[model samples]
Target: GAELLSQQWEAGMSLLMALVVLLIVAGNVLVIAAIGSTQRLQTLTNLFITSLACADLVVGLLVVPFGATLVVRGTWLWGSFLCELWTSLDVLCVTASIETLCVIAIDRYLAITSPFRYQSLMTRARAKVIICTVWAISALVSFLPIMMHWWRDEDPQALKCYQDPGCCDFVTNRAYAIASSIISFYIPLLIMIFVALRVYREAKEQMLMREHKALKTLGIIMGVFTLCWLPFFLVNIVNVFNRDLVPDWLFVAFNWLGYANSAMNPIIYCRSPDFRKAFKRLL
Candidate 1:
């Protein structure tokens, strides 16, 4: 009876996780298509939007599919090499997406508060450079640890006989995890907060033709960033000290929470008046 109940629960979780992955894939695809089709929306800010959507789409395409497969099968059937590839791409895309949020926040700050200088500083050429830099940095940071053998595949006996196999154990190096967390999450989060506050303060006194448009756009971007990512980062800090304290349920919950971010961006942008009109015209 106990085994039956456990199997039922796992089956339910697999179904739910599949639904979440489908939603992420569909929503992020629409965002990329909508933005790419609309010319007027292709500003520097939109460039960041494109970059974020691309990152999220990659996560939806690559990470979530394999993860859902593992969840449904109740095991990691893929070999160790494929597992490492999946995990590495997962880390790289997620880090790139979050870093793109920081870039968007800074872009919004300049656009809303310093409109005259924004165009000069954040030209298309500059946006291209920054987007390239963000992806390159993300790839370098995420894959470097693995290349250096900071993570390794665990033997079956060493894995405590879990159904899931492959690289089940992560690098036990405290310094590496802490440093990666600081560089990838902590620093970007601080910068985003600072930029958000500055935008709020500056928008209060300004009245211009683009007042409503700019504020609405930036508000959606910042609001989603905070909502989707804060819990994940908070959990990261907690996990640093009490690594094994995170139960499987909570880990799965937070994983879904992070993935939900990919689905929300298209909704936020499509709901905007200017974006909505532009999207319809493009469609």
Candidate 2:
């Protein structure tokens, strides 16, 4: 009876964690479907939004589920190769996500501040270039460290052991943490916040604003993005400086919080009447 109850508890906990990933995937897919089906949403800005949503879908669909599996198991029960694969995908999908958000913010900035040049400035081809660049940079960040075997504290393959990819401090080097923070969170945060405030000031001045729409919507979008991600980066930095100070559970929990960001965008879209209408129409 004790063993059976313990097994049942594990099953229930796994189910609850799995639900977290499901919500993220389901929310982003709805955004993608709405964008794809609406026809009118294929505009330049919307294209960036669509790409961001797609990135969110990738993170939720591929990364979060894997992370949840590792977190729940409390060990990387899978082989060393899988540890590498899972972590690599997490870095890739998440890196691409923030990069896409930054690019979209920049695109929107141009659209708001220099409306006349926005057409020439952010053409479909240009947006495509930005999108491609974001993925390329993400690929670099994800693959380079793993390929070099620099991301892990021990060689899982050599030890025939588990690295618990979900939580490790001394594993990934400081240089990677510093670089990752700048590339993944800090720089993007600056670009999104600073440039956005300027754009908002201009929009508010035009008397063309709606509920401070330009700033509020875009601000909320990036604000949520930054808030969701910043804590994880900070925790990583702390671990890098003093790994012992950061508990294993905190590392795992921060990662889960970051995954929560994937679902927030679709929730943001829910605020849009057009998004709601399109979602309803598609249904």
Per residue, candidate 1 scores C-alpha lDDT tens digits across 53-113 of 8887887788888887776666677876677678788778778987888888787777777
Model 1, residue 179: distance off in Å is: 1.4
Candidate 2 off by > 4 Å: 1-5, 152-170, 210-215
**Candidate 1 segments exceeding 4 Å error:** 1-15, 151-172, 207-210, 243-248, 278-283
Estimate the TM-score for candidate 1. Answer: 0.84
RMSD in angstroms, candidate 2?
3.1
TM-score of each: 0.84, 0.87
- Clashing pairs for model 2 are none
Provide the clashing-pair count of each candidate structure: 0, 0
